[PDB]
Amino acid sequence: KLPEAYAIFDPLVDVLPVIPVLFLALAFVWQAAVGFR
Amino acid sequence: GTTGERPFSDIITSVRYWVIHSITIPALFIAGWLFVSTGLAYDVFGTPRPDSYYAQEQRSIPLVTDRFEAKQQVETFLEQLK
Amino acid sequence: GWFDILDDWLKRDRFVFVGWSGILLFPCAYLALGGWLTGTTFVTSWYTHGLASSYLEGCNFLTVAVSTPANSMGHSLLLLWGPEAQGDFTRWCQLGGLWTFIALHGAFGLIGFMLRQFEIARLVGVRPYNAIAFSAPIAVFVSVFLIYPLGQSSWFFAPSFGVAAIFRFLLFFQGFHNWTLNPFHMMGVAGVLGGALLCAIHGATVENTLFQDGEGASTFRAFNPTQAEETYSMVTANRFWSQIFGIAFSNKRWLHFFMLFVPVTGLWMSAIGVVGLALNLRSYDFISQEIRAAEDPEFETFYTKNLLLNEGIRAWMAPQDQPHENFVFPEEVLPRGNAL
Amino acid sequence: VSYPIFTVRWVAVHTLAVPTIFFLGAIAAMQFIQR
Amino acid sequence: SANLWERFCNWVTSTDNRLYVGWFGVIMIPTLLAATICFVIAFIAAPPVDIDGIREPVSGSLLYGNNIITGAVVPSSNAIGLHFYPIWEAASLDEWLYNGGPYQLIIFHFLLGASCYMGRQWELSYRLGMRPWICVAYSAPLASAFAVFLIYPIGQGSFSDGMPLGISGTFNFMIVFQAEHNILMHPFHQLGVAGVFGGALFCAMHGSLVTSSLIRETTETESANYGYKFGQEEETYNIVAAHGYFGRLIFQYASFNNSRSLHFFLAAWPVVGVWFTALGISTMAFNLNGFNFNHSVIDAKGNVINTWADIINRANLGMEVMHERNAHNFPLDLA
Amino acid sequence: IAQLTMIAMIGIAGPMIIFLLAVRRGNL
Amino acid sequence: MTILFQLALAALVILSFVMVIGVPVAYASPQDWDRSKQLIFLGSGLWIALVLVVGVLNFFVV
Amino acid sequence: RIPLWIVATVAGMGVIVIVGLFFYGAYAGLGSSL
Amino acid sequence: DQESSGFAWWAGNARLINLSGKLLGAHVAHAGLIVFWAGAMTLFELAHFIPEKPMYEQGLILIPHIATLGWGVGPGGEVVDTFPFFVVGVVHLISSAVLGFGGVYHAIRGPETLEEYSSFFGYDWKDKNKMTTILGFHLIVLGIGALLLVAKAMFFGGLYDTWAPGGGDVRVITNPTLDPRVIFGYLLKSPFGGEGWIVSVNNLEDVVGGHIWIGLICIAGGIWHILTTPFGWARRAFIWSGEAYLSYSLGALSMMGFIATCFVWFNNTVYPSEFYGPTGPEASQAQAMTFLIRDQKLGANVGSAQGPTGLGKYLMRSPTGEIIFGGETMRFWDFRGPWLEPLRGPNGLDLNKIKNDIQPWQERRAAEYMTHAPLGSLNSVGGVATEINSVNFVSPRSWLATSHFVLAFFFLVGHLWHAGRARAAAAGFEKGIDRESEPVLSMPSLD
Ligand code: CLA
Ligand code: CLA
Ligand code: CLA
Ligand code: CLA
Ligand code: CLA
Ligand code: CLA
Ligand SMILES: CC1=C(/C=C/C(C)=C/C=C/C(C)=C/C=C/C=C(C)/C=C/C=C(C)/C=C/C2=C(C)CCCC2(C)C)C(C)(C)CCC1
Ligand SMILES: CC1=C(/C=C/C(C)=C/C=C/C(C)=C/C=C/C=C(C)/C=C/C=C(C)/C=C/C2=C(C)CCCC2(C)C)C(C)(C)CCC1
Ligand SMILES: [Ca+2]
Ligand SMILES: [Cl-]
Ligand SMILES: [Fe+2]
Secondary structure: OOOHHHHHHHHHHOOHHHHHHHHHHHHHHHHHHOOOO | OOOOOOOHHHHOOOHHHHHHHHHHHHHHHHHHHHHHHOOHHHHHOOOOOOOOOOOOOOOOOOOOOOOOOHHHHHHHHHHOOO | OHHHHHHHHHOOOOOOOOHHHHHHHHHHHHHHHHHHHHHHHOOOEHHHHOEOOOHHHOOOOOOOEEOOOOOOOOOOOOOOOOOOOOOOHHHHHHOOHHHHHHHHHHHHHHHHHHHHHHHHHHHHOOOOHHHHHOHHHHHHHHHHHHHHHHHOOOHHHOOOEEOHHHHHHHHHHHHHHOHHHOHHHHHHHHHHHHHHHHHHHHHHHHHOOEEOOOOOOOOOOOOOOOOOEOOEOHHHHHHHHHHHOOOOOOOHHHHHHHHHHHHHHHHHHHHHHHHHHHOOOOOOOOHHHHHHHHHOOOOOOHHHHHHHHHHHHHHHHHHHHOHHHOOOOOHHHOOOOOOO | OOOOOOOHHHHHHHHHHHHHHHHHHHHHHHOOOOO | OOOHHHHHHHHHOOOOOOOOOOOOHHHHHHHHHHHHHHHHHHHHHOOOEOOOOOOOOEOOOHHHOOOOOOOEEOOOOOOOOOOOOOHHHOOOHHHHHHOOHHHHHHHHHHHHHHHHHHHHHHHHHHHOOOOOOHHHHOHHHHHHHHHHHHHHHHHHOOHHHOOOEEHHHHHHHHHHHHHHHOHHHOHHHHHHHHHHHHHHHHHHHHHHHHHHOEOOOOOOOOOOOOOOOOOOOEOOEOHHHHHHHHHHHOOHHHOOOOHHHHHHHHHHHHHHHHHHHHHHHHHHHHOEEOOOOOOOOEOOOOOEOOOHHHHHHHHHHHHHHHOOOOOOOOOOOOO | OOOHHHHHHHHHHHHHHHHHHHHOOOOO | OHHHHHHHHHHHHHHHHHHHHHHHHHHHOOOOOOOHHHHHHHHHHHHHHHHHHHHHHHHHHO | OOOHHHHHHHHHHHHHHHHHHHHHHOOOOOOOOO | OOOOOOOOHHHHHHHHOOOOOHHHHHHHHHHHHHHHHHHHHHHHHHHHOOOOOOOHHHOOOOHHHHHHOOOOEOHHHOEOOOHHHHHHHHHHHHHHHHHHHHHHHHHHOOOOOOOOOOOOOOOOOOOHHHHHHHHHHHHHHHHHHHHHHHHHHHOOOOEEEOOOOOOOEEEOOOOOOOOHHHHHHHHHOOOOOOOOHHHHOOOHHHHHHHHHHHHHHHHHHHHHHHOOOOOOHHHHHOOOOHHHHHHHHHHHHHHHHHHHHHHHHHOOOOOOOOOOOOOHHHHHHHHHHHHHHHHHHOOOOHHHOOOOOOOOOOEEEOOOOOEEEOOHHHHHOOOOOOOOHHHOOEOEOOHHHHHHOOOHHHHHHHHHHHOOOOOEEOOOOOOOOOOOOOOOOOOHHHHHHHHHHHHHHHHHHHHHHHHHHHHHHHHOOOOOEOOOOOHHHHOOOOO
């Protein structure tokens, strides 16, 4: 498990992996905002 | 390219719309939620609760076996505390 | 006269065209869709098949379904107010009243819809080949969800409305009717499979045989919504296929009629095959094969092999798949190969 | 233009729109039932 | 002679050939003639093949008791596995026909040629100045033959597990597959049937819409087809009338008016769906099978409450327990 | 227990860094 | 040392969150990134020391 | 006037949330196996 | 600057085909996502990692990659120190921020083009030299990397050698096979059963040795391209454009993707069954081992046992005469593995060793691997499709192999697609047939 100290971040690290997906997503939030030019 | 209806786009953007549906939508949601959470749904559809498939001992199924006296037969199945 | 006023109103061009047909379509179409969505999440199949079948019980989008009525019901229409349910709603639900509901309603809904096509076609003044085509899906629904079980012992053997609940319908037909070996089912697939080819092949032939009518790369905008010239080189397409396949179209009118024909004919054939499976008049065996297999123990074809797969399907499934038969097959009677 | 409100389109939209949310609410609740 | 080879290359590549023998063709034409010629002879006269490596020959040719529907070319032996078995690897043909040698000679040449067939579907498009990509549509059906004839066998460890070359032999491949992988319960197969069902569906939609909205130019007693001449300038149907009808059937914005967007969809759908189906077989070739919901829903005491998912498992067990009667000696089927 | 707290923020973050741009109107 | 470590590590997270939403809108609206070219610089420089702080400081807690 | 691109990304996350609740429900509910 | 009057929205990134600078942000921002993942995932794995339990039973696929390079493990793949894992994880995660910075910067602030803001970095697709040169730079960076491995193995610690004499263990390779005859021999190996081509590598010397050759051969070509231009054919053969170059690299990855799928599925060495799961063939072999072992204890003479077909319940012969395990497992007679080798003789499985040299650690190895074959469902229910829920498991070897066949595949489509576009783009018709000059119309009728 995460070294004893960082344990408080266990939960944080639990979501990190999925972030990359978000970017592919954001690119769409953006284009929508910029009215699909 | 058009008909009488007010262009969805306009409506889904009207602050009036949200002012109405921010109330209406969650309304419907919390209702159905309660429909399940209050156990009402189980009675509206005769659907068994996790503790009502079999009687404690029995391991047989409450199979309806004849059309006409079916309803009657079903009622009896509920009897054995099924 | 009110009639022409009633008409006037109906045939009025709205967002969602109503029309006379709608008076039949929408009531039903909505009830069918509704009943499904209802049962899928609320009604169970315990008193009917000894099966959990709704979200409320724990089923997921694949395992959920509106299961058929008991076998006791027979071919009963199971009306909410009929001898079975007796006006009671909950009982109706537990006796699988929701099946004949979805079935019969959706049935009328397919009539209404085809009528619609017919009605809208007429108004807009176009030919009704969209309606002719839709006869194919009607036939399938009619023969499979109605004619079939009408030939069997009861509605219980009709396909239950649900994803997985349909896969067992497939497995069943293999195992009991050896349906894959049926000339009509084959034509069926040749059409659906062959139809999904024309679809793909024609689409690509068009997109990669287009003229340049724009200066952009994304050639979609370069299209004239207002006819005029052919948007793709029909002449080039002809030469392409004529050199890579040897044969190639050269009459868009025929190429498009062909596309109606192939998949509609396919589904019609697959229907006839089932109309025959109703009476169990299946295409199960090849007698010459069986006779040689009896006398000679070393004769083995991929056919004989299959039949054994069927025996296993029937023996291991029949028990929990036909509850009303109170089947009890001692472990020693169960067909099995070595080790497995 | 001076668009209306209650229209035929509206009716339909709600016949499907209203029940749906009611179900999504029902189902969302089931995710917690147990044994 | 402007230079023999210079000429040769001009012929091969010539766009004036009745059939475009291309560069890819130079590999295609021979491999495909071998595959075809070996098949036809096999299917008609080949003798029984010990497909399962257990000395229990399965005859699948016409002259040995089969009919078109049952007959097939049987897969190489399991004793052979993934080993290469070219004729020159056998003491004799008698030995080669018994271990299912013809199967490999056929699948390899076919798969080889069917690829070049793709390479060609590009080349000709190039020599003709038309956009490529048609060959990319054909990548789907090809990617399937590949999945069913090579990936699955590589994955499973033997060519004897590849799909047989015959009608019934194929049903066998299917029925067993289902038992060992529960494919019907796999996302990729479902996407596959959506694409195929959908395709046929759309194929019918387009086909009808168009054919039904054709501009009249024919007699009442004259084939409506003649109303079209090869090499026309303008269109032969009212795509605006078509859209007019279809837009009213469902509703306007849910209908195509752009023939180009229509046809892209028309191609995109099936090809994309079949791509997934091919990836399904190529994926279940490494034992990542369909969803296993066996005994999921259980009651308050622990009893198992069956779902249709379970009724499906029984049908699968029947297949499992009966396929390959004599080939198993142990508990688990890991092959 | 409920690190959904995390996601939530890093989630409205993506749309935020473009929204603030919709406000400061510029370079989208 | 420990809380001292959890401070540096925890602050280092909020700076990142802040830095991440910042730099973007920064180069985004050219309403400066001249005055913010100052802010960003301090965030960037700061960050590194922090990583080095948590780095060296890790070997004393865990 | 509420900017469309926001109506979407909001109604969007909103669906990934409910549909995600369903996926969680698959390892806890009755549809569990435990 | 760039909008719809460039390309369509959904083809947006092609609008960067000619903006070197911004096209750099992308590649620098992207390369960030990979480090981010690698880093962020490792910590996710470690956060869930349970020391006293197989890695393959925990859905790990990175920690096992580190373990192989000899890190945090010892005798038999026993996990000793989880620090190297935490380290590798956090380090990457950090560097992701550094790279991400540059990416974002080069794509929204810095120069939109490079050619002017520095002629060294700016580039021209058709510039056969700039291309051959940048390629040359990267050919060196990759070459150094190949040696960065040779170093870790020979100097810095070793790698996990499962074939370890004393039994699986971290070992320092100090004798890399450099003999070209052998090294390159692998490339001349059949890709079929038995001779397995690259995937048949079975000892660390060749691995290390071979990487030595690649590192050099690679950097050599890095200099050569720096110092040159494509010859003549090299030019009259290829297409020189932004897309065309992509395509070539697309088909390249595809191929490496398929080769990787087979490596993780078949190879035992560079993918230790100790961290990943037992190989497909390895598991089927273990069942035979297990039962030949069992029944033999019940008094059965394995050597002469006759099965239903009359072939040999436990032992039979392969097509070339060697003694192998019987049953459907006859197809995996090419399986070799630490646990099973000591039973092999010069003619294959030796009936005497099998008869009294089987060791307990082998019996339980065979049992372990038998019950951990790479069979499972999408929802992760280990076993055969007809199995029951309980053992939540799907071999890392299955996950890896499938994911990479899909990616490998779609990339081959990607290749075809971008190559088809490049050839039409070059000659110039990738936007339609010239209504006026319609080529087909100038060709004789074949009819
Ligand atoms: C590509 C290689 C790859 C591989 C081989 C793995 C492998 C693994 N992952 Mg990792 N993962 C990856 C990438 C990868 N991951 C990425 C990029 C992320 C960031 C999102 C993660 C995030 C992640 C998490 C958060 C977790 C894992 C876990 C796991 C393990 C369990 C697998 C599982 O439960 O799958 C189940 C998943 C599926 C069935 C999803 C299939 C989705 C496919 C690809 C979609 C197909 C749709 C297609 C794209 C549609 C487009 C069509 C349209 C255009 C028309 C397994 C070892 C789990 C673990 O470690 O626990 C033990 C875990 O909790 N992974
Ligand atoms: C207009 C479209 C429409 C149509 C065609 C149908 C059709 C059907 N419904 Mg559905 N239904 C609809 C709308 C429609 N429904 C709507 C909107 C709702 C929601 C309120 C329902 C709710 C519903 C329920 C709850 C049930 C059905 C059922 C049925 C089926 C059989 C019922 C029956 O026996 O009717 C008989 C038909 C008539 C009453 C028509 C009589 C017409 C003549 C001209 C009138 C003469 C009247 C006069 C009094 C008689 C003089 C004779 C004298 C000797 C006494 C049938 C397929 C049942 C079912 O599905 O069973 C499995 C069922 O239980 N429906
Ligand atoms: C090596 C990597 C690579 C690179 C750098 C490029 C680069 C490029 N591609 Mg190619 N492509 C690749 C691989 C690659 N491609 C592969 C493997 C395929 C086969 C599928 C394609 C197929 C392809 C097509 C069909 C097209 C391009 C186009 C383009 C150009 C414009 C980019 C674009 O349209 O973005 C826009 C991107 C999107 C709208 C994103 C679509 C999202 C995908 C399909 C979803 C993947 C699912 C995801 C994993 C699921 C997560 C879950 C989600 C709910 C969050 C650009 C030069 C376009 C062009 O104009 O050609 C020159 C074009 O039309 N590419
Ligand atoms: C792999 C991911 C990826 C990457 C690196 C890029 C990169 C790029 N895109 Mg592409 N794009 C992608 C995916 C990607 N795209 C997909 C999937 C699609 C289809 C939806 C598109 C569609 C697309 C279009 C339609 C266009 C581009 C354009 C561009 C270029 C200009 C950037 C821009 O417009 O900023 C605009 C700036 C903003 C509104 C700010 C967005 C927020 C930033 C970038 C993110 C910050 C990230 C993180 C939270 C903070 C880190 C901070 C920390 C280090 C301290 C740039 C090279 C444009 C172009 O052609 O260039 C001229 C263009 O018109 N792209
Ligand atoms: C993919 C690699 C990459 C490349 C090719 C470039 C290229 C460029 N950058 Mg960008 N940059 C990158 C990554 C990259 N950058 C990243 C990750 C960041 C975030 C930190 C930045 C931040 C950045 C800024 C802030 C600026 C640039 C600028 C520039 C341009 C001017 C040249 C220069 O800065 O020289 C710098 C000087 C050198 C040649 C020395 C670099 C040496 C370092 C210390 C070693 C790197 C070691 C490396 C990791 C190991 C390789 C060794 C191996 C072979 C043995 C040039 C086009 C400038 C610009 O926009 O002007 C037009 C500018 O102001 N870049
Ligand atoms: C991966 C990075 C890389 C890349 C992208 C390139 C790219 C290039 N190289 Mg360089 N090269 C590299 C690494 C690389 N090289 C290294 C490491 C070395 C040192 C060994 C060289 C040595 C080198 C030389 C000596 C030459 C090039 C040349 C060239 C150019 C033309 C090549 C060509 O036409 O091939 C296509 C070649 C053929 C027509 C032959 C096809 C036959 C192949 C080899 C076998 C069949 C392949 C089969 C599918 C694979 C299975 C495996 C096999 C072992 C069984 C091209 C720009 C040429 C040039 O123009 O120089 C400036 C040239 O003369 N390169
Ligand atoms: C926090 C943190 C961090 C970092 C982070 C990052 C780097 C992030 C990023 C992030 C991101 C980057 C995010 C994103 C998000 C997103 C979202 C959430 C989206 C959404 C979307 C949507 C919902 C959409 C929709 C739609 C539709 C459906 C239709 C069409 C149109 C549209 C597009 C509108 C660290 C590690 C330091 C530490 C701890 C903390
Ligand atoms: C251009 C563009 C784009 C893209 C982008 C990208 C590609 C990005 C990236 C980004 C990135 C790539 C980023 C990164 C970041 C990072 C960070 C921010 C990090 C941090 C870290 C940390 C902080 C660490 C530490 C730790 C430890 C050691 C342990 C405990 C826990 C923790 C976590 C705390 C888009 C599509 C949107 C749109 C258009 C444009
Ligand atoms: Ca945790
Ligand atoms: Cl069989
Ligand atoms: Fe068409």
